[PDB]
């Protein structure tokens, strides 16, 4: 719908004939999606340079061979000699095998275009709608916004698509149009129509143009355009399909792309040269075009098998399936080019509230009295598992789980908790989640009796709200709360007077139970209790409970302790003064103490084991919290960052101490800083501008308007879930936990897809390294052929292929999180993997032609068993007296090369074993870690089983069937390039990092 802005709420409502109180019937839906398409730009022609330098090039290769294939098989006729079989069927048998090649790149194109189709799932749905489907509002993607269903916004919210308000249900509605008008001075909206319908967006005051943010309110609208019509959309559209601005690794690539073209060429031109002294061979029949043509079909073929295909799918599949196991992990990562960055991250400066804390109040240590003997106690020290307001976790002793039941000192601290307490617990059915109702240091006592049970009552087959306020219930059916002695600061205390329920005992029973801080409530205990009964409050064993609570709040973990005692004879009611909380303090005197509980805001879900996993990977994190410096302190060494006993003076700063700073020292503050407490949202900015003075790769969490610059500074953006919609588009990243522990795990993934992408290079390069070579050491040295055009083309399909594109699958390696952050700025090569591709490549290319001059030098019960000059075996037909009782055409049998044909496939299968991992070995990391290599090595060994085997085969590739004696030779040579890599990988394992 054009000029919507000119047309009525009305008149926009008949033009898509829907109701602002129902939406679009599904009949609508699906015929609008199909007319105006999808809310998005066009994709951009990813045309590579990569494409066209190696993949368009190679394409031409394998026509220029199969053309110089149908030359020579025409020349072939004209040949009045014995009409030959083999060189008869090569067109044939190419064209056969280019067949296959095309094939397995279909599978490895239509694997990445699955693997990037479903990430679409894991698309935020950052928009909502009305449909006529259900009669509340709903949540769905972005690009599914067709022109004409109602959709609801709200604050924080980025507009959709371009929207016409139909009604503000806020008082006002405040939008931010900066991104477009130029203005972050948010603009007023409403619902009348502009009548102008030649006016310009600023005048526009009642359309909702996408992209924008809305400041304040809630508005309900119609959608008018979506995609490309959108008024920012055609702004959008400059940069749509015409831009320039590759990643740092797709240059790296398209980088090594143009080395790799340049080398390849070279080396079979070099083949194609040094060859032109046999153009002239008997074997070639004596003509100079017969035998150039034949050599160039070499070359060509070397050069097919040399050039490493199928990169570009498989770096694509790796990083989608990749990104589709971070989202499935609560990391959604937006943009697929954030992830080798994502990977690079050095610097995590995480938010403390949601993210690094549960920021739900959970108690996790008590104690009670266990014994006393000779005025002195042991205690009885339990830990309480779960760290949010659920009911669920269990209670400790001695890291054993035990029932509260079996002791009655937890019976009545239960109890206490349950009383002396104004709050209560709630099961929010719409979030699906427990909410705290009231105070949190008094929902964590609630939480806490849930988690107890100390009546072991039937909770199992409850429901999430019956659940909520079970135990606690139960309890409460037991003693009447007659009333409340509200808190004191004077006393740091406060109490409850309570009866036995269903009593006609008015006067007997009646307890108070006291709880506040444990010094001012130990002070006015006059008895102890151990199980059921007391005993007088002793000195030692008055000091040694105090001693408990002063390590639980010295500690590590910092407890906030609560002293529980209970009045077992309370002052008549009658003589209660309840006006004046000054009197309180009398009342809760001559006190038996039960126990003490200890609670804290604890850490999130394997966030402390994230935090060890950053040290280890040598990603530097800083705590952004909003609480003082001291216990930002103490919060930083109860989860991980600093140690239970460091010195934090260097290395923790406010707000107001940073700002003292120079600049000089306060970029040198962020440099060992680890902790800032209560900062101003610019400062985030300036730690960002800061870090990246050092060249770190950082990582800013974000939730809310005043983030968003420093989330868009930062080189991984990382909004929350729960955040508002505004800080998302400024993010690279989304935690759909909101916890610190996902964006580890995001990192961790990110690390993995870098590492899949060199074992997958690693193994291609290294393999068909050799294979060059292996055509060159014959030549240079001087030994007969070992290979022919359509044994290259062979090696090619079955080496390059399948086992090639298993490895993308490989898992994450073990010491992944155990090395330092990528500089994004290192080589895509460095000199010393360049080595481990020449030293494993110069192997299986000598392995390859000594398997083949092991036939003619050193041969084992074979025929032609010459140890001197194969060198000039052009001359064997020149002096005879060299040989004895074998002819010269010993030299053309197809015994060393089906041997150097199967070393090399075998070596290189051999080799894929290598690229299970960089540096870890095959004793560490098993070849059964990749089942979709093995079955790859399977299959591509079956296919080498089938040529060898079945009989038209190994005719129209000039081999012979090997005994299996001859077999466990060809394994004797290509095991041995396990253990030379092997030895290379303890090397730079064990010297080259550690
Ligand atoms: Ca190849
Ligand atoms: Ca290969
Ligand atoms: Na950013």
Not at 649 to 668: K, N, S, V
Request: charge should be negative; charged fraction near 25%.
């Amino acid at each position: 719908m054009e000029a919507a802005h000119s047309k009525s709420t009305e008149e926009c409502l008949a033009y898509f004939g829907v109701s602002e109180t129902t939406g679009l019937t599904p009949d609508q839906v699906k015929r609008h999606l199909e007319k105006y398409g999808h809310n998005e730009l066009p994709a951009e022609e990813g045309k590579s340079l990569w494409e066209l330098v190696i993949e368009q090039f190679e394409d031409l290769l394998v026509r220029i061979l199969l053309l110089a294939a149908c030359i020579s098989f025409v020349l072939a006729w004209f040949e009045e000699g014995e009409e030959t079989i083999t060189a008869f069927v090569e067109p044939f048998v190419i064209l056969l095998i280019l067949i296959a090649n095309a094939i397995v790149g279909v599978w490895q194109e239509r694997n990445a275009e699955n693997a990037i189709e479903a990430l679409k799932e894991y698309e935020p749905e950052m928009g909502k709608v009305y449909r006529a489907d259900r009669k509340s509002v709903q949540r769905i993607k972005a690009r599914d916004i067709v022109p004409g269903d109602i959709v609801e916004v709200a604050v924080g919210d980025k507009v959709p698509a371009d929207i016409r308000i139909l009604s503000i249900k806020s008082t006002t509605l405040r939008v931010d149009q900066s991104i477009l008008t130029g203005e972050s001075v948010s603009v007023i909206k409403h619902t009348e129509p502009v009548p102008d319908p030649r006016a310009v967006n600023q005048d526009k005051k009642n359309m909702l143009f996408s992209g924008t943010n809305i400041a304040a309110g809630k508005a309900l609208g119609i959608v008018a355009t979506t995609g490309v019509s959108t008024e920012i959309g055609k702004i959008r559209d400059q940069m749509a399909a015409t831009e320039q601005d590759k990643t740092p690794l797709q240059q790296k690539l398209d980088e090594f792309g143009e080395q790799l073209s340049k080398v390849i060429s070279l080396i079979c031109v070099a083949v194609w040269l040094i060859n032109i002294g046999h153009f002239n061979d008997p074997v070639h029949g004596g003509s100079w075009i017969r035998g150039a043509i034949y050599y160039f079909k070499i070359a060509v073929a070397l050069a097919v098998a040399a050039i490493p295909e199928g990169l570009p799918a498989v770096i694509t599949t790796c990083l989608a399936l990749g990104t589709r196991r971070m989202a499935k992990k609560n990391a959604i990562v937006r943009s697929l080019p954030s992830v080798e960055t994502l990977g690079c991250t050095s610097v995590i400066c995480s938010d403390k509230t949601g993210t690094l804390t549960t920021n739900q109040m959970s108690v996790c240590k008590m104690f009670i009295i266990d014994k006393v003997d000779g005025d002195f106690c042991s205690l009885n020290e339990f830990s309480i598992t779960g760290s949010t307001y659920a009911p669920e976790g269990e209670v400790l002793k001695n890291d054993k789980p035990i029932r509260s039941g079996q002791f009655d000192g937890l019976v009545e601290l239960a109890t206490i908790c349950a009383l002396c307490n104004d709050s209560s617990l709630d099961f929010n059915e719409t979030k699906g989640v427990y909410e705290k109702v009231g105070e949190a240091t008094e929902t964590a006592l609630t939480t806490l009796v849930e988690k107890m049970n100390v009546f072991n009552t039937e909770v199992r087959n409850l429901s999430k709200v019956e659940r909520a306020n079970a135990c606690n219930s139960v309890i409460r059916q037991l003693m009447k709360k007659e009333f409340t002695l509200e808190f004191s600061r004077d006393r740091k205390s406060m109490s409850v007077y309570c009866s036995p329920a269903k009593s006609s005992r008015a006067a007997v029973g009646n307890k108070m139970f006291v709880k506040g801080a444990p010094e001012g409530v130990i002070d006015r205990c006059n008895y102890v209790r151990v199980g059921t009964t007391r005993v007088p409050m002793t000195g030692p064993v008055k000091e040694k409970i105090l001693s408990v609570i002063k390590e639980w709040g010295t500690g590590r973990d910092t407890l906030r302790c609560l002293a529980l005692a209970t009045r077992d004879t309370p002052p008549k009611r009658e003589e209660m003064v309840l006006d004046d909380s000054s009197r309180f303090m009398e009342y809760e005197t001559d006190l038996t103490f039960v126990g003490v509980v200890g609670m804290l805001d604890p850490p999130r879900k394997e966030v402390m084991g994230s935090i060890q996993l950053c040290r280890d990977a040598g990603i530097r994190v800083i705590m952004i919290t909003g609480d003082n410096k001291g216990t930002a302190i103490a919060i930083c060494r109860r989860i991980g960052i600093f140690g239970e006993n460091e010195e934090v003076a260097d290395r923790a700063y406010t707000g107001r101490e940073f700002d003292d700073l120079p600049l000089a020292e306060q970029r040198e503050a962020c440099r060992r800083a680890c902790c800032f407490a209560r900062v101003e949202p610019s400062h985030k900015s300036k730690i960002v501008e800061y870090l990246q003075s050092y060249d770190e790769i950082t990582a800013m969490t974000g939730d809310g308007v005043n983030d968003a610059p420093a989330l868009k500074k930062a080189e991984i953006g990382i909004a929350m879930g729960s955040g508002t919609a505004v800080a998302k588009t400024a993010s690279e990243m989304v935690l759909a936990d909101d916890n610190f522990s996902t964006i580890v795990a995001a990192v961790e993934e990110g690390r993995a897809i870098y590492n899949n992408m060199k074992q997958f290079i690693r193994y291609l390069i290294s393999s068909n390294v050799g294979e060059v070579v292996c055509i060159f050491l014959t030549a240079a040295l001087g030994l007969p052929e070992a290979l022919i055009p359509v044994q290259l083309l062979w090696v090619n399909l079955v080496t390059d292929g399948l086992p090639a594109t298993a490895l993308g699958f490989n898992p994450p390696d073990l010491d992944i999180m155990d090395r330092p952050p990528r500089s994004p700025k290192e080589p895509l090569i460095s000199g010393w993997l360049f080595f481990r591709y020449m030293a494993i490549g110069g192997y299986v290319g000598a392995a390859t032609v000594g398997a083949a001059a092991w036939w003619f030098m050193y041969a084992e019960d074979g025929p032609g068993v010459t140890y001197h000059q194969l060198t000039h075996f052009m001359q064997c037909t020149e002096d005879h007296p060299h040989f004895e009782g074998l002819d010269c055409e010993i030299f053309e049998a197809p015994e060393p090369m089906t041997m150097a044909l199967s070393v090399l496939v075998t070596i290189e299968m051999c080799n894929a074993l290598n690229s299970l991992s960089e540096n870890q070995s095959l004793m560490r990391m098993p070849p059964w870690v990749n089942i979709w290599l093995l079955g790859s090595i399977c299959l591509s060994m079956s296919l080498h089983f089938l040529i060898l085997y079945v009989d038209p085969l190994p005719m129209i590739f000039k081999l012979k069937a090997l005994d299996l004696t001859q077999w466990l030779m060809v394994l004797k040579i290509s095991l041995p390039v396990i253990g030379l890599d092997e030895i290379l990988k303890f090397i730079a394992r064990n010297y080259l990092e550690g």
